[PDB]
Symmetry: D2
Subunit: 116 residues, 4 copies
């Protein structure tokens, strides 16, 4: 995969499973145009988002749905999504994995970028 997203639950120490994810690309007029979407697997991973020729140079946003993921805990989180923005391929053929560790009021994200 040119783009893969992986999500972990830092409260229970488990993959975050069946969670919705939306991907956008910034367009000419400055709006976020819809690019790809899905739900995470049993390992907290979402594979198969895009193709090598669809994944053109530009700026991308990843939105992970969190509103009710912690409902069973009794806590409402800081926002309805966890989100990251990244700039891609100003420089060539590269593959990206976006990794997120999530809690209701805190998260850590990392972009791992490799040249095949």
């Amino acid at each position: 995969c040119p783009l893969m997203v992986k999500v972990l639950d830092a409260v229970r120490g488990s993959p975050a499973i069946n969670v919705a994810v939306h991907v956008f690309r910034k367009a000419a007029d400055d709006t976020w145009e819809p690019f790809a979407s899905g739900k995470t697997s049993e390992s907290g991973e979402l594979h198969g988002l895009t193709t090598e020729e669809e994944f053109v140079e530009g700026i991308y946003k990843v939105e992970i749905d969190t509103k009710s993921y912690w409902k069973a805990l009794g806590i409402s989180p800081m926002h309805e999504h966890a989100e990251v923005v990244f700039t891609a391929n100003d420089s060539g053929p590269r593959r990206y994995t976006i990794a997120a560790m999530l809690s209701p009021y805190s998260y850590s994200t990392t972009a791992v970028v490799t040249n095949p």
Copy 2:
């Protein structure tokens, strides 16, 4: 302070000094409206952004400028900004501190909400 932002440099182990911060609020037409701005102090802190009256319920984005902060290192980061989005909910005015610990390809943020 209804809203304070504090920024740490996780590569050199120090406050991030003199870095630009812009804050926005989501508007009627779904675009981001300019809300408040300033630059961090000697301690990495930014006070005085807004007032209890201007800071109504809604959805807010904090943008921290990182385009050149890493140059002397010889590394260009994952993106020209670090961005945090939060919802200010109920009833009921709260005070917010947004803390961000920054590296070129990673970041950890935390929102602390009191009252």
Copy 3:
């Protein structure tokens, strides 16, 4: 303070208040020797640990007590403590702030080192 410790609760979005903290210094025989202790304030901070004179060069461990901090949440955490190790003062005086963002199965810790 030559040494200050600050603790945040990443699950509830609050300072972590009334939490026990232990500090140790490495000895010759390679055992950790007790060096200072206390409980955090209403701001999640612990001030007054040591003096400039007592805070000599060496290797230090900070232990934050977490066993039952999240009991009211229904979760047992990954360990009875969150711990950090650091190497101190190599040239001239330096002041340290150890900051920790805590959840049951994850944490983020940062050392901020400043020249007075």
Copy 4:
């Protein structure tokens, strides 16, 4: 694998490759006893450390060598190791993955435990 370790470089945005990992268990006399060791692969992952029979309930420390890892950056880190301590199985038996995202003056670590 009953125990897997994975290491990421948060400064360059890549897996941490060929880095040394030593694992210990808290012994009778309260000292750390050597338990298992290895080096990370091209993916930043370390598999094959132990067996279901050897990995009994107890307290374990994972030590990641970082002394010379950012020398080429020009910075000396907060300490010569990154360390995680966890209690097992507590449980038992579960499978553990310890993930660490590393910078010179910071780190983030997460234990994922499955049955």
